[PDB]
């Protein structure tokens, strides 16, 4: 018998969620989730979105999620190469631009926005809960 | 009925050390915040150890918001008391700011950016509930 999640994480449904300790570019944030046996946030449902917004409701920080694209001719995809399911959210912000290191999505103050991947943000990591 | 593998804390709470913590998702007055914790068979935050303080300081570092704790002072002639009736010990913090007889329902304490302040209990803030972890 092990706890579903380590101390300091939030257990929700099948997963465990953690806010990153620091603010880094998307690539570094991805590496830091991987080091914790985790991945960047993947939103599969509006229930997941509502859970995350309630968890970040007290923060004004931007948090990277695992969604990115090279440029606007590419669809948004999660780190695992799966697609963004429809009717979850509309990515706002910098959606028409091409950045040398791609465009990445973050959640901030109740909405999802596109940004240049080289800029810094906090991030949310997630991993499967031990059930 | 007897659990196969009891989790330390319920879903949506955060486990740290001996306790479970539940951060609110909105701002409410102290009485409504107290009621919410009681409804869950829990209580408002009681920072009683260095482990509790270190955890809360890190968790609230993502926020500029105030979070009510379970500490209040009926009127300036009375002491600060936790919801359990115990006194405020001087080890971890003092409550900064004003206590006033003009406040209709006493003065309450909140933690904000690591420090603890006094405020009129009828004002709205985020809050934190706590209960013992099932270890």
PDB file of C-alpha atoms in Angstrom:
ATOM      1  CA  UNK A   1       0.000   0.000   0.000  1.00  0.00           C
ATOM      2  CA  UNK A   2       1.540   3.268  -1.188  1.00  0.00           C
ATOM      3  CA  UNK A   3       0.027   6.764  -1.151  1.00  0.00           C
ATOM      4  CA  UNK A   4      -1.623   7.691  -4.505  1.00  0.00           C
ATOM      5  CA  UNK A   5       0.713  10.719  -4.753  1.00  0.00           C
ATOM      6  CA  UNK A   6       3.834  12.034  -3.055  1.00  0.00           C
ATOM      7  CA  UNK A   7       3.657  14.769  -0.422  1.00  0.00           C
ATOM      8  CA  UNK A   8       3.015  18.237  -1.840  1.00  0.00           C
ATOM      9  CA  UNK A   9       1.277  16.995  -5.021  1.00  0.00           C
ATOM     10  CA  UNK A  10      -2.485  17.112  -5.584  1.00  0.00           C
ATOM     11  CA  UNK A  11      -4.203  13.797  -6.193  1.00  0.00           C
ATOM     12  CA  UNK A  12      -7.083  14.158  -8.655  1.00  0.00           C
ATOM     13  CA  UNK A  13      -8.750  11.240 -10.404  1.00  0.00           C
ATOM     14  CA  UNK A  14      -6.168   8.942 -11.920  1.00  0.00           C
ATOM     15  CA  UNK A  15      -3.330  11.460 -11.644  1.00  0.00           C
ATOM     16  CA  UNK A  16      -1.023  13.514  -9.390  1.00  0.00           C
ATOM     17  CA  UNK A  17      -0.310  17.191 -10.128  1.00  0.00           C
ATOM     18  CA  UNK A  18       2.546  19.431  -9.034  1.00  0.00           C
ATOM     19  CA  UNK A  19       3.389  23.104  -9.548  1.00  0.00           C
ATOM     20  CA  UNK A  20       6.991  23.581 -10.650  1.00  0.00           C
ATOM     21  CA  UNK A  21       9.431  25.103  -8.210  1.00  0.00           C
ATOM     22  CA  UNK A  22      10.735  27.544 -10.843  1.00  0.00           C
ATOM     23  CA  UNK A  23      10.028  29.441 -14.031  1.00  0.00           C
ATOM     24  CA  UNK A  24      11.873  28.328 -17.156  1.00  0.00           C
ATOM     25  CA  UNK A  25      11.468  28.053 -20.903  1.00  0.00           C
ATOM     26  CA  UNK A  26       9.216  25.268 -22.203  1.00  0.00           C
ATOM     27  CA  UNK A  27      12.032  22.828 -23.052  1.00  0.00           C
ATOM     28  CA  UNK A  28      13.579  23.164 -19.592  1.00  0.00           C
ATOM     29  CA  UNK A  29      10.150  22.851 -17.991  1.00  0.00           C
ATOM     30  CA  UNK A  30       9.568  19.631 -19.976  1.00  0.00           C
ATOM     31  CA  UNK A  31      12.924  18.245 -18.766  1.00  0.00           C
ATOM     32  CA  UNK A  32      12.106  19.120 -15.166  1.00  0.00           C
ATOM     33  CA  UNK A  33       8.764  17.244 -15.290  1.00  0.00           C
ATOM     34  CA  UNK A  34      10.477  14.246 -16.898  1.00  0.00           C
ATOM     35  CA  UNK A  35      13.064  14.176 -14.077  1.00  0.00           C
ATOM     36  CA  UNK A  36      10.201  13.818 -11.571  1.00  0.00           C
ATOM     37  CA  UNK A  37       8.872  10.749 -13.451  1.00  0.00           C
ATOM     38  CA  UNK A  38       6.144  13.025 -14.804  1.00  0.00           C
ATOM     39  CA  UNK A  39       5.116  15.028 -17.901  1.00  0.00           C
ATOM     40  CA  UNK A  40       3.751  18.483 -18.570  1.00  0.00           C
ATOM     41  CA  UNK A  41      -0.008  18.919 -17.945  1.00  0.00           C
ATOM     42  CA  UNK A  42      -2.260  17.199 -20.499  1.00  0.00           C
ATOM     43  CA  UNK A  43      -5.929  18.305 -20.441  1.00  0.00           C
ATOM     44  CA  UNK A  44      -8.222  15.521 -21.629  1.00  0.00           C
ATOM     45  CA  UNK A  45     -11.601  16.904 -20.613  1.00  0.00           C
ATOM     46  CA  UNK A  46     -13.406  20.008 -19.366  1.00  0.00           C
ATOM     47  CA  UNK A  47     -13.412  18.274 -15.937  1.00  0.00           C
ATOM     48  CA  UNK A  48      -9.599  18.347 -16.056  1.00  0.00           C
ATOM     49  CA  UNK A  49      -9.656  22.027 -17.086  1.00  0.00           C
ATOM     50  CA  UNK A  50     -12.001  22.932 -14.228  1.00  0.00           C
ATOM     51  CA  UNK A  51      -9.875  21.003 -11.711  1.00  0.00           C
ATOM     52  CA  UNK A  52      -6.745  22.861 -12.875  1.00  0.00           C
ATOM     53  CA  UNK A  53      -8.405  26.269 -12.744  1.00  0.00           C
ATOM     54  CA  UNK A  54      -9.656  25.630  -9.221  1.00  0.00           C
ATOM     55  CA  UNK A  55      -6.093  24.574  -8.248  1.00  0.00           C
ATOM     56  CA  UNK A  56      -4.509  27.723  -9.756  1.00  0.00           C
ATOM     57  CA  UNK A  57      -7.372  30.075  -8.831  1.00  0.00           C
ATOM     58  CA  UNK A  58      -5.245  31.836  -6.212  1.00  0.00           C
ATOM     59  CA  UNK A  59      -2.290  32.413  -8.557  1.00  0.00           C
ATOM     60  CA  UNK A  60      -1.713  34.944 -11.294  1.00  0.00           C
ATOM     61  CA  UNK A  61       1.294  33.027 -12.664  1.00  0.00           C
ATOM     62  CA  UNK A  62       1.389  31.487 -16.144  1.00  0.00           C
ATOM     63  CA  UNK A  63       1.807  27.715 -16.145  1.00  0.00           C
ATOM     64  CA  UNK A  64       3.070  25.822 -19.206  1.00  0.00           C
ATOM     65  CA  UNK A  65       1.129  22.778 -20.260  1.00  0.00           C
ATOM     66  CA  UNK A  66       2.309  20.016 -22.617  1.00  0.00           C
ATOM     67  CA  UNK A  67       0.797  21.519 -25.780  1.00  0.00           C
ATOM     68  CA  UNK A  68       2.890  22.982 -28.559  1.00  0.00           C
ATOM     69  CA  UNK A  69       3.435  23.393 -32.274  1.00  0.00           C
ATOM     70  CA  UNK A  70       6.272  24.350 -34.552  1.00  0.00           C
ATOM     71  CA  UNK A  71       4.341  27.051 -36.378  1.00  0.00           C
ATOM     72  CA  UNK A  72       0.678  27.781 -37.329  1.00  0.00           C
ATOM     73  CA  UNK A  73       0.616  25.248 -40.198  1.00  0.00           C
ATOM     74  CA  UNK A  74       0.913  22.493 -37.550  1.00  0.00           C
ATOM     75  CA  UNK A  75      -1.971  21.419 -35.316  1.00  0.00           C
ATOM     76  CA  UNK A  76      -1.572  21.717 -31.560  1.00  0.00           C
ATOM     77  CA  UNK A  77      -0.324  18.403 -30.128  1.00  0.00           C
ATOM     78  CA  UNK A  78       0.478  17.115 -26.652  1.00  0.00           C
ATOM     79  CA  UNK A  79       4.002  15.833 -25.855  1.00  0.00           C
ATOM     80  CA  UNK A  80       2.878  12.235 -26.610  1.00  0.00           C
ATOM     81  CA  UNK A  81       1.849  13.280 -30.161  1.00  0.00           C
ATOM     82  CA  UNK A  82      -1.864  12.991 -29.387  1.00  0.00           C
ATOM     83  CA  UNK A  83      -4.197  15.738 -30.553  1.00  0.00           C
ATOM     84  CA  UNK A  84      -5.982  18.459 -28.651  1.00  0.00           C
ATOM     85  CA  UNK A  85      -9.534  17.118 -28.337  1.00  0.00           C
ATOM     86  CA  UNK A  86     -12.225  19.501 -29.531  1.00  0.00           C
ATOM     87  CA  UNK A  87     -14.509  21.563 -27.292  1.00  0.00           C
ATOM     88  CA  UNK A  88     -12.083  21.834 -24.370  1.00  0.00           C
ATOM     89  CA  UNK A  89     -10.615  25.290 -24.904  1.00  0.00           C
ATOM     90  CA  UNK A  90      -9.687  27.848 -27.540  1.00  0.00           C
ATOM     91  CA  UNK A  91      -5.960  28.784 -27.491  1.00  0.00           C
ATOM     92  CA  UNK A  92      -5.802  32.586 -27.367  1.00  0.00           C
ATOM     93  CA  UNK A  93      -2.759  34.919 -27.439  1.00  0.00           C
ATOM     94  CA  UNK A  94       0.083  34.587 -29.942  1.00  0.00           C
ATOM     95  CA  UNK A  95      -1.491  32.147 -32.416  1.00  0.00           C
ATOM     96  CA  UNK A  96      -0.612  33.682 -35.820  1.00  0.00           C
ATOM     97  CA  UNK A  97       3.146  34.169 -35.268  1.00  0.00           C
ATOM     98  CA  UNK A  98       6.131  31.859 -36.064  1.00  0.00           C
ATOM     99  CA  UNK A  99       8.892  31.697 -33.444  1.00  0.00           C
ATOM    100  CA  UNK A 100      12.313  30.177 -34.050  1.00  0.00           C
ATOM    101  CA  UNK A 101      11.759  27.620 -31.232  1.00  0.00           C
ATOM    102  CA  UNK A 102       8.014  27.017 -31.700  1.00  0.00           C
ATOM    103  CA  UNK A 103       4.839  28.091 -29.985  1.00  0.00           C
ATOM    104  CA  UNK A 104       3.770  26.609 -26.653  1.00  0.00           C
ATOM    105  CA  UNK A 105       0.610  26.916 -24.545  1.00  0.00           C
ATOM    106  CA  UNK A 106       0.218  28.025 -20.968  1.00  0.00           C
ATOM    107  CA  UNK A 107      -2.766  28.424 -18.646  1.00  0.00           C
ATOM    108  CA  UNK A 108      -3.140  31.672 -16.770  1.00  0.00           C
ATOM    109  CA  UNK A 109      -6.028  33.248 -14.922  1.00  0.00           C
ATOM    110  CA  UNK A 110      -8.653  30.927 -16.411  1.00  0.00           C
ATOM    111  CA  UNK A 111      -7.644  30.726 -20.074  1.00  0.00           C
ATOM    112  CA  UNK A 112      -5.099  29.067 -22.378  1.00  0.00           C
ATOM    113  CA  UNK A 113      -2.683  31.218 -24.321  1.00  0.00           C
ATOM    114  CA  UNK A 114      -0.016  30.689 -26.950  1.00  0.00           C
ATOM    115  CA  UNK A 115       3.514  32.047 -26.432  1.00  0.00           C
ATOM    116  CA  UNK A 116       7.042  31.834 -27.781  1.00  0.00           C
ATOM    117  CA  UNK A 117       8.518  28.614 -26.241  1.00  0.00           C
ATOM    118  CA  UNK A 118      11.783  30.387 -25.370  1.00  0.00           C
ATOM    119  CA  UNK A 119      10.115  32.623 -22.769  1.00  0.00           C
ATOM    120  CA  UNK A 120       9.743  31.549 -19.155  1.00  0.00           C
ATOM    121  CA  UNK A 121       6.761  30.378 -17.172  1.00  0.00           C
ATOM    122  CA  UNK A 122       6.047  28.138 -14.213  1.00  0.00           C
ATOM    123  CA  UNK A 123       4.570  24.758 -15.217  1.00  0.00           C
ATOM    124  CA  UNK A 124       2.297  22.009 -14.014  1.00  0.00           C
ATOM    125  CA  UNK A 125       3.589  18.440 -14.046  1.00  0.00           C
ATOM    126  CA  UNK A 126       1.454  15.344 -13.835  1.00  0.00           C
ATOM    127  CA  UNK A 127       1.963  11.634 -13.397  1.00  0.00           C
ATOM    128  CA  UNK A 128      -0.249   8.602 -12.823  1.00  0.00           C
ATOM    129  CA  UNK A 129      -1.397   8.059  -9.245  1.00  0.00           C
ATOM    130  CA  UNK A 130      -0.537   4.791  -7.493  1.00  0.00           C
ATOM    131  CA  UNK A 131      -3.968   3.188  -7.157  1.00  0.00           C
TER     132      UNK A 131
ATOM    133  CA  UNK B   1     -15.907  -0.970   4.055  1.00  0.00           C
ATOM    134  CA  UNK B   2     -12.464  -1.432   5.758  1.00  0.00           C
ATOM    135  CA  UNK B   3     -10.047   0.230   3.282  1.00  0.00           C
ATOM    136  CA  UNK B   4      -7.638  -1.871   1.261  1.00  0.00           C
ATOM    137  CA  UNK B   5      -5.143   1.011   1.016  1.00  0.00           C
ATOM    138  CA  UNK B   6      -6.114   4.237   2.759  1.00  0.00           C
ATOM    139  CA  UNK B   7      -4.779   7.341   1.038  1.00  0.00           C
ATOM    140  CA  UNK B   8      -3.214   9.885   3.454  1.00  0.00           C
ATOM    141  CA  UNK B   9      -5.578  12.609   2.126  1.00  0.00           C
ATOM    142  CA  UNK B  10      -8.699  12.884  -0.028  1.00  0.00           C
ATOM    143  CA  UNK B  11      -8.655  13.853  -3.695  1.00  0.00           C
ATOM    144  CA  UNK B  12      -8.003  17.564  -4.322  1.00  0.00           C
ATOM    145  CA  UNK B  13      -6.268  18.042  -0.967  1.00  0.00           C
ATOM    146  CA  UNK B  14      -2.458  18.263  -0.506  1.00  0.00           C
ATOM    147  CA  UNK B  15      -0.624  15.957   1.874  1.00  0.00           C
ATOM    148  CA  UNK B  16       2.289  17.386   3.883  1.00  0.00           C
ATOM    149  CA  UNK B  17       3.717  15.613   6.909  1.00  0.00           C
ATOM    150  CA  UNK B  18       1.079  14.770   9.469  1.00  0.00           C
ATOM    151  CA  UNK B  19      -1.677  16.830   7.774  1.00  0.00           C
ATOM    152  CA  UNK B  20      -3.906  17.309   4.720  1.00  0.00           C
ATOM    153  CA  UNK B  21      -4.639  20.749   3.355  1.00  0.00           C
ATOM    154  CA  UNK B  22      -7.482  22.043   1.157  1.00  0.00           C
ATOM    155  CA  UNK B  23      -7.042  25.425  -0.496  1.00  0.00           C
ATOM    156  CA  UNK B  24     -10.194  27.297  -1.324  1.00  0.00           C
ATOM    157  CA  UNK B  25     -11.015  28.347  -4.904  1.00  0.00           C
ATOM    158  CA  UNK B  26     -12.704  31.604  -3.941  1.00  0.00           C
ATOM    159  CA  UNK B  27     -12.760  34.424  -1.413  1.00  0.00           C
ATOM    160  CA  UNK B  28     -15.230  34.253   1.532  1.00  0.00           C
ATOM    161  CA  UNK B  29     -15.642  35.856   4.979  1.00  0.00           C
ATOM    162  CA  UNK B  30     -14.189  34.057   8.015  1.00  0.00           C
ATOM    163  CA  UNK B  31     -17.472  32.578   9.202  1.00  0.00           C
ATOM    164  CA  UNK B  32     -18.239  31.086   5.758  1.00  0.00           C
ATOM    165  CA  UNK B  33     -14.673  29.809   5.493  1.00  0.00           C
ATOM    166  CA  UNK B  34     -14.971  28.201   8.969  1.00  0.00           C
ATOM    167  CA  UNK B  35     -18.298  26.619   7.966  1.00  0.00           C
ATOM    168  CA  UNK B  36     -16.817  25.144   4.807  1.00  0.00           C
ATOM    169  CA  UNK B  37     -14.068  23.389   6.763  1.00  0.00           C
ATOM    170  CA  UNK B  38     -16.469  22.154   9.450  1.00  0.00           C
ATOM    171  CA  UNK B  39     -18.835  20.781   6.772  1.00  0.00           C
ATOM    172  CA  UNK B  40     -15.957  18.484   5.620  1.00  0.00           C
ATOM    173  CA  UNK B  41     -15.260  17.342   9.216  1.00  0.00           C
ATOM    174  CA  UNK B  42     -12.097  19.450   9.050  1.00  0.00           C
ATOM    175  CA  UNK B  43     -10.979  22.818  10.528  1.00  0.00           C
ATOM    176  CA  UNK B  44      -9.342  26.020   9.373  1.00  0.00           C
ATOM    177  CA  UNK B  45      -5.526  26.017   9.080  1.00  0.00           C
ATOM    178  CA  UNK B  46      -3.685  25.811  12.391  1.00  0.00           C
ATOM    179  CA  UNK B  47       0.070  26.468  11.888  1.00  0.00           C
ATOM    180  CA  UNK B  48       1.483  24.605  14.860  1.00  0.00           C
ATOM    181  CA  UNK B  49       4.878  23.272  13.745  1.00  0.00           C
ATOM    182  CA  UNK B  50       7.840  24.386  11.638  1.00  0.00           C
ATOM    183  CA  UNK B  51       6.849  21.699   9.082  1.00  0.00           C
ATOM    184  CA  UNK B  52       3.385  23.303   8.790  1.00  0.00           C
ATOM    185  CA  UNK B  53       4.850  26.759   8.380  1.00  0.00           C
ATOM    186  CA  UNK B  54       7.452  25.716   5.797  1.00  0.00           C
ATOM    187  CA  UNK B  55       4.795  23.911   3.752  1.00  0.00           C
ATOM    188  CA  UNK B  56       2.330  26.826   3.866  1.00  0.00           C
ATOM    189  CA  UNK B  57       5.029  29.408   3.051  1.00  0.00           C
ATOM    190  CA  UNK B  58       5.959  27.403  -0.070  1.00  0.00           C
ATOM    191  CA  UNK B  59       2.351  26.764  -1.113  1.00  0.00           C
ATOM    192  CA  UNK B  60       1.296  30.416  -0.795  1.00  0.00           C
ATOM    193  CA  UNK B  61       4.447  31.646  -2.597  1.00  0.00           C
ATOM    194  CA  UNK B  62       2.426  31.137  -5.841  1.00  0.00           C
ATOM    195  CA  UNK B  63      -0.109  33.730  -4.609  1.00  0.00           C
ATOM    196  CA  UNK B  64      -0.411  37.315  -3.479  1.00  0.00           C
ATOM    197  CA  UNK B  65      -3.813  36.455  -1.855  1.00  0.00           C
ATOM    198  CA  UNK B  66      -4.639  36.420   1.830  1.00  0.00           C
ATOM    199  CA  UNK B  67      -5.682  33.040   3.331  1.00  0.00           C
ATOM    200  CA  UNK B  68      -7.728  32.899   6.518  1.00  0.00           C
ATOM    201  CA  UNK B  69      -6.472  30.636   9.289  1.00  0.00           C
ATOM    202  CA  UNK B  70      -8.332  29.298  12.332  1.00  0.00           C
ATOM    203  CA  UNK B  71      -7.077  32.052  14.660  1.00  0.00           C
ATOM    204  CA  UNK B  72      -9.249  34.868  16.016  1.00  0.00           C
ATOM    205  CA  UNK B  73      -9.564  37.442  18.787  1.00  0.00           C
ATOM    206  CA  UNK B  74     -13.047  38.254  20.048  1.00  0.00           C
ATOM    207  CA  UNK B  75     -12.176  41.821  21.014  1.00  0.00           C
ATOM    208  CA  UNK B  76      -9.061  43.736  22.058  1.00  0.00           C
ATOM    209  CA  UNK B  77      -9.443  42.608  25.729  1.00  0.00           C
ATOM    210  CA  UNK B  78      -9.392  38.915  24.771  1.00  0.00           C
ATOM    211  CA  UNK B  79      -6.416  36.833  23.635  1.00  0.00           C
ATOM    212  CA  UNK B  80      -5.835  35.332  20.216  1.00  0.00           C
ATOM    213  CA  UNK B  81      -7.192  31.770  20.234  1.00  0.00           C
ATOM    214  CA  UNK B  82      -7.249  28.950  17.733  1.00  0.00           C
ATOM    215  CA  UNK B  83     -10.659  27.359  16.934  1.00  0.00           C
ATOM    216  CA  UNK B  84      -9.775  24.595  19.385  1.00  0.00           C
ATOM    217  CA  UNK B  85      -9.554  27.089  22.290  1.00  0.00           C
ATOM    218  CA  UNK B  86      -5.736  26.917  22.574  1.00  0.00           C
ATOM    219  CA  UNK B  87      -3.638  30.092  22.757  1.00  0.00           C
ATOM    220  CA  UNK B  88      -1.372  31.507  20.123  1.00  0.00           C
ATOM    221  CA  UNK B  89       2.162  30.452  21.039  1.00  0.00           C
ATOM    222  CA  UNK B  90       5.016  32.833  20.179  1.00  0.00           C
ATOM    223  CA  UNK B  91       7.256  30.330  18.319  1.00  0.00           C
ATOM    224  CA  UNK B  92       6.224  30.615  14.697  1.00  0.00           C
ATOM    225  CA  UNK B  93       4.680  34.065  14.220  1.00  0.00           C
ATOM    226  CA  UNK B  94       2.985  37.071  15.726  1.00  0.00           C
ATOM    227  CA  UNK B  95      -0.146  38.605  14.237  1.00  0.00           C
ATOM    228  CA  UNK B  96       0.677  41.990  12.675  1.00  0.00           C
ATOM    229  CA  UNK B  97      -1.792  44.812  12.364  1.00  0.00           C
ATOM    230  CA  UNK B  98      -4.914  46.054  14.062  1.00  0.00           C
ATOM    231  CA  UNK B  99      -7.534  44.601  16.343  1.00  0.00           C
ATOM    232  CA  UNK B 100     -10.696  46.761  16.688  1.00  0.00           C
ATOM    233  CA  UNK B 101     -13.749  46.849  18.907  1.00  0.00           C
ATOM    234  CA  UNK B 102     -15.546  48.383  15.887  1.00  0.00           C
ATOM    235  CA  UNK B 103     -15.338  45.082  13.969  1.00  0.00           C
ATOM    236  CA  UNK B 104     -18.801  43.486  14.349  1.00  0.00           C
ATOM    237  CA  UNK B 105     -17.644  39.853  14.719  1.00  0.00           C
ATOM    238  CA  UNK B 106     -14.097  40.219  16.072  1.00  0.00           C
ATOM    239  CA  UNK B 107     -10.679  40.154  14.462  1.00  0.00           C
ATOM    240  CA  UNK B 108      -9.290  37.187  12.505  1.00  0.00           C
ATOM    241  CA  UNK B 109      -5.858  36.236  11.215  1.00  0.00           C
ATOM    242  CA  UNK B 110      -4.786  35.512   7.665  1.00  0.00           C
ATOM    243  CA  UNK B 111      -1.450  34.530   6.134  1.00  0.00           C
ATOM    244  CA  UNK B 112      -0.254  36.461   3.085  1.00  0.00           C
ATOM    245  CA  UNK B 113       3.153  36.349   1.435  1.00  0.00           C
ATOM    246  CA  UNK B 114       4.546  34.427   4.398  1.00  0.00           C
ATOM    247  CA  UNK B 115       3.486  36.891   7.171  1.00  0.00           C
ATOM    248  CA  UNK B 116       0.382  36.832   9.391  1.00  0.00           C
ATOM    249  CA  UNK B 117      -1.990  39.785   9.689  1.00  0.00           C
ATOM    250  CA  UNK B 118      -5.130  40.772  11.551  1.00  0.00           C
ATOM    251  CA  UNK B 119      -8.313  41.806   9.773  1.00  0.00           C
ATOM    252  CA  UNK B 120     -12.021  42.386  10.312  1.00  0.00           C
ATOM    253  CA  UNK B 121     -13.580  38.860  10.197  1.00  0.00           C
ATOM    254  CA  UNK B 122     -16.434  39.933   7.877  1.00  0.00           C
ATOM    255  CA  UNK B 123     -14.069  40.691   4.953  1.00  0.00           C
ATOM    256  CA  UNK B 124     -13.463  38.028   2.277  1.00  0.00           C
ATOM    257  CA  UNK B 125     -10.259  36.091   1.736  1.00  0.00           C
ATOM    258  CA  UNK B 126      -9.184  32.704   0.383  1.00  0.00           C
ATOM    259  CA  UNK B 127      -8.774  30.051   3.145  1.00  0.00           C
ATOM    260  CA  UNK B 128      -7.171  26.749   3.902  1.00  0.00           C
ATOM    261  CA  UNK B 129      -8.776  23.774   5.637  1.00  0.00           C
ATOM    262  CA  UNK B 130      -6.784  21.071   7.346  1.00  0.00           C
ATOM    263  CA  UNK B 131      -7.248  17.645   8.838  1.00  0.00           C
ATOM    264  CA  UNK B 132      -4.992  14.840  10.035  1.00  0.00           C
ATOM    265  CA  UNK B 133      -3.476  12.620   7.344  1.00  0.00           C
ATOM    266  CA  UNK B 134      -4.351   8.912   7.518  1.00  0.00           C
ATOM    267  CA  UNK B 135      -0.899   7.367   7.953  1.00  0.00           C
TER     268      UNK B 135
END
